[PDB]
Amino acid sequence: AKKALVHKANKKPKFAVRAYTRCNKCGRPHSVYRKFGLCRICLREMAHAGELPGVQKSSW
Amino acid sequence: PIQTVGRRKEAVVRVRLVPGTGQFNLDGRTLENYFPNKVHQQLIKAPLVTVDRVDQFDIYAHLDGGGPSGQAGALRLAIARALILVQPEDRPALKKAGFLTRDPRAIERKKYGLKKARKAPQYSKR
Amino acid sequence: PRKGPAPKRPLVNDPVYGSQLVTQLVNKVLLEGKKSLAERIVYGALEQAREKTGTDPVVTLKRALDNVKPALEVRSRRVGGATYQVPVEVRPDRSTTLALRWLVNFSRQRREKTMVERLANEILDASNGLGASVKRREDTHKMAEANRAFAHYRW
Amino acid sequence: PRSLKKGPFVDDHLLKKVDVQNEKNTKQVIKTWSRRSTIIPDFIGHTFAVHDGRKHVPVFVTEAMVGHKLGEFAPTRTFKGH
């Protein structure tokens, strides 16, 4: 993600319609889950490292 | 007081036995009114038919969850178990007939990447 | 089937009459898995045949299956770069099952405008010996007795 | 189609330009950079130069095309066939 674009997105837009996520660190505008605030690969890596208190693999 | 519970594919049922007449009370309505299916009535009457004590027990049923067939089978199991409880002397014939053996099959887990249950997406080598 | 003969399911019997042939027929004619629809249609057509013929539905069905059940079949085989057919005897159980299959197949593909009546009429025709099922059986027996020559292969 | 309650939408700058033009009675070709501007009866005798991305193409407006957007009459893609 381009730093200039990230900074512009962080800035306050002149219209409310121009608000979008832009996953925080990697700046990926796509494949991001709202509550987490992180994209698919970010979630994968952080969960595998165990940095979030409560996510874990699935087997039911 | 005699109580019993039957479960099959998420079909929990309640039955209370009464030596009075052969009245069927399914949520306040008779068996013929509730689930009017000949296969149902047949399977529900199968245990009493096997034991040959017809028109001697009154049953009140409370049903929650499950489907029609599931509820019918659970009720059959419940009345069979209640009959055994009130008189275990029929154990060897009823177990040989298979009325006292529960049915240990239900909806199974289905895979991620598969449509449902055991389904498989179209698999073409092209 | 590599390990060996697989177990066979314990097919149930029909309580309405007392013959598992009715259960077999309804299972064969099952379309889109509508059991109640299939069984009600089968019972209605059986009653139609009964009122049309004036006889016992079970007896006439037994007559039809007896008349239409084959005893010899034909199997395909290719040897030495050439295709050939061989006749092989068939178990009566499989013969009855395939007879039911042909009954359904020829109860599917005729132009009587109403299949509920048409299946009954097809049953009457098969019982009387003018049916497409008996015609197919005639053709199958003719093929088998024509290819009798290649029976030496025995497979 | 735009809802009647909201009504037609006209850009403020182009509205000011056309108002000045029709008030001064001068009729000239105006460089139009707006594709979302709807047509108004006041545009009956005004010429607008719409931008298609390559060059401002003038268009003459009459009463016939009332109720249609400016970009409808300005092709955006060139298709010469095969």
Partner: protein
């Protein structure tokens, strides 16, 4: 993909979360600040190996506990690095921030710091041969640890090719959930590019 990380695979049985706190409304802001501060600390401190970073949050108060190879440079005799870290956290607006230093017992009984050392030796001048030999010997010398496996991937020696070589000794039963595996991963720098080093350590078994 070849192998899933044993840490993630065995989270639910043996290893515990290294961060514990409850929130749902400000959960986004909280996770943002934690991941930020973690990245900033990682990029700020490189001289001294840091095994793990654990954060616990109780309402406004936040406590961070640090494990490092040696505290000499992690905390100064007068508190140089301590005061720099405090000032950093205050700039990040951690509200009430409390610092603690916890020292590991066995320096080379765990994956992270041995990985750091191997990366440093590979980067500076040391050959991967001697690097693996010394690392394996030092890890073995400790009685508690039983199995060690070290893998190095990337460009080795400046050759225009990728060499994937691994050396194994002792226990590596990743399929057995009961086993205890320690996982580490760090990247070694060099003039020609980047090299990744991965190490697995087995430490006994747990019943209960």
């Amino acid at each position: 993909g070849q192998k899933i990380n044993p840490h993630g695979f065995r989270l639910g049985i043996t290893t515990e979360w290294k961060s514990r706190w409850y929130a749902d409304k400000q959960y986004k802001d909280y996770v943002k600040e934690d991941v930020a501060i973690r990245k900033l600390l990682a990029t700020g401190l490189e001289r001294a190996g840091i095994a793990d970073v654990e954060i616990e949050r109780t309402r406004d108060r936040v406590r961070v506990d640090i494990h490092t190879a040696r505290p000499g440079i992690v905390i100064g005799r007068r508190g140089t690095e301590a005061d720099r870290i405090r000032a950093d956290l205050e700039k990040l607006t951690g509200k009430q921030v409390q610092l603690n230093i916890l020292e590991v017992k066995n320096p080379e009984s765990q994956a992270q710091l041995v990985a750091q050392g191997v990366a440093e030796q590979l980067s500076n001048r040391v050959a991967f041969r001697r690097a693996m030999r010394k690392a394996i010997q030092s890890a073995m010398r400790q009685p508690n640890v039983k199995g060690i496996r070290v893998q190095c991937s990337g460009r080795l020696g400046g050759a225009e090719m990728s060499r994937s070589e691994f050396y194994r000794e002792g226990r590596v039963p990743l399929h057995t959930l009961r086993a205890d595996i320690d996982y580490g991963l760090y990247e070694a720098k060099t003039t020609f590019g980047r090299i990744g080093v991965k190490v697995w350590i087995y430490k006994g078994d747990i019943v209960g």
